[PDB]
Write an enzyme that holds these catalytic residues in place. Sequence first.
Site, PDB file in Angstrom:
ATOM      1  N   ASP A  62       0.856  -1.178   0.000  1.00  0.00           N
ATOM      2  CA  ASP A  62       0.000   0.000   0.000  1.00  0.00           C
ATOM      3  C   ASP A  62       0.901   1.240   0.000  1.00  0.00           C
ATOM      4  O   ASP A  62       1.754   1.384   0.876  1.00  0.00           O
ATOM      5  CB  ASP A  62      -0.866  -0.027   1.267  1.00  0.00           C
ATOM      6  CG  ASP A  62      -1.984   1.001   1.253  1.00  0.00           C
ATOM      7  OD1 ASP A  62      -1.788   2.122   0.734  1.00  0.00           O
ATOM      8  OD2 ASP A  62      -3.101   0.775   1.765  1.00  0.00           O
ATOM      9  N   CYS A 100      -3.840   9.079 -15.058  1.00  0.00           N
ATOM     10  CA  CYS A 100      -4.579   8.995 -16.303  1.00  0.00           C
ATOM     11  C   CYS A 100      -5.879   9.757 -16.140  1.00  0.00           C
ATOM     12  O   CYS A 100      -6.929   9.327 -16.594  1.00  0.00           O
ATOM     13  CB  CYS A 100      -4.787   7.562 -16.755  1.00  0.00           C
ATOM     14  SG  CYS A 100      -5.565   6.545 -15.530  1.00  0.00           S
TER      15      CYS A 100
END
Length: 424
Positions: free
Chosen positions: A299, A371
């Site tokens: 993580d 993105c």
Amino acid sequence: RNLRSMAAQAVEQVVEQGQSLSNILPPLQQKVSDKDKALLQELCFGVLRTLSQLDWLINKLMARPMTGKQRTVHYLIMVGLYQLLYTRIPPHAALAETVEGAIAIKRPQLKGLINGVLRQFQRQQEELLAEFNASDARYLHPSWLLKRLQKAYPEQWQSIVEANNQRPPMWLRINRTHHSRDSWLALLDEAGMKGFPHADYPDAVRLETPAPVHALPGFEDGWVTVQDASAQGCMTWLAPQNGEHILDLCAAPGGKTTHILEVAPEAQVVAVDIDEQRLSRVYDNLKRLGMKATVKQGDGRYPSQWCGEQQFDRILLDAPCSATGVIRRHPDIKWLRRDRDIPELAQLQSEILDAIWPHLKTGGTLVYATCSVLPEENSLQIKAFLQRTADAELCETGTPEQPGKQNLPGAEEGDGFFYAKLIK
């Protein structure tokens, strides 16, 4: 089996239950042959892409749309409308198959209604479409997102939504260790397929028409990888070098991981990502290209859990994000994301940036990529990090005033994407 029923159920899971098409489709596609798989995909992606229109039409045709216990029927009718609007399947056959789809969704008693609603659409198609094309729904984006794009891109928003609605170009990345781009293109031509280069992405080839991966010269040999051009652009900024310890954070599916090694075969790359679902992807890419790297589950909020106090020479952070730049490839994004998600994602990006920066060695290079096409996750984000991180310095991507470089989607371009390069 009935493909229309399958498509209705899949779209319902995305829109009503928040499931990703990438997770629901696999188990479904595996049951069917190649032609049926293609049609199932066409229906699922198509209904998601055009949902604004299909929902608008339902609201014009039905005083009371199907809800609750009958919600699957709503999606089945939309699947029917999609066939009438966007395919050349003989309408009588489209109607028959969609109606029969009532049996697999366990609502056979609704056949008459499905047929009736679709026939009513056929009766009123002309006027309904003329009306639709004068409405804001014609842009095929939910209001919250359309408005965000209109605000962020006062001049370009129409071109952006239009590009989001196109069928996406199949971009490939040629492995320079085996062939030059131009050499591989010659193989493609000999294979009877057409491809195009791009002036800004040296390893990229855009196929004139999408092909299955098994049809690409040397895919199994690691000669080529399917990867959108914008993501390929990360290497220009990361500029990896042999011997370096490079972190590729949020690495799945492993496309950038291998690109680093194509550029720098002797780099000591560590690829990390959340679960053992996104990690299988990375193992595959590494195997296929005959590369080695350390692949860890981890993580980005808590780096020490997987890298203790280790530092890296370069870090490529493909930040969790709204993925608004990749709507053309994943129309489900339009229905899975909500307006409220943007500030949350912006704060996660902020948290990850904070947690990972300490793990950059002095003089190292971090490349922050997304993105997304939304400023809050992109330029505005980098500026906030700079403001609160004294030892960070922007490098070449944009300006201290407007950090980073923003790509917008287009037919002969990569996905909407953003880059910011930082050095400590």
